[PDB]
Design a protein around this ligand. Structure first.
Ligand SMILES: [Ca+2]
Ligand SMILES: [Ca+2]
Ligand SMILES: [Ca+2]
Ligand SMILES: [Mg+2]
Length: 69
């Protein structure tokens, strides 16, 4: 994968969340890289819509970057 680009793009998106809790949701989302899809994995995130959106968007960004490497 392109870990330098990955870091950069996740930083870009994480900066949009203005609290450390949804920031962490983003960062955790971007770590998703096993057999579960972003949709499957986010289904178990239960701390609110912002957290869910952050997880989703960062997981999707990370997935795109890994696929394109
Ligand atoms: Ca912190
Ligand atoms: Ca977690
Ligand atoms: Ca605990
Ligand atoms: Mg935990």
């Amino acid at each position: 994968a392109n870990l330098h680009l990955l870091r950069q793009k996740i930083e870009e998106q994480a900066a949009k969340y203005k609290h450390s809790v949804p920031k962490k949701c983003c960062y955790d989302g971007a770590r998703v890289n096993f057999y579960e899809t972003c949709e499957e994995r986010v289904a178990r995130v239960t701390i609110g819509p912002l957290c869910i959106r952050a997880f989703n968007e960062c997981c999707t960004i990370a997935n795109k970057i890994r696929k394109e490497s």
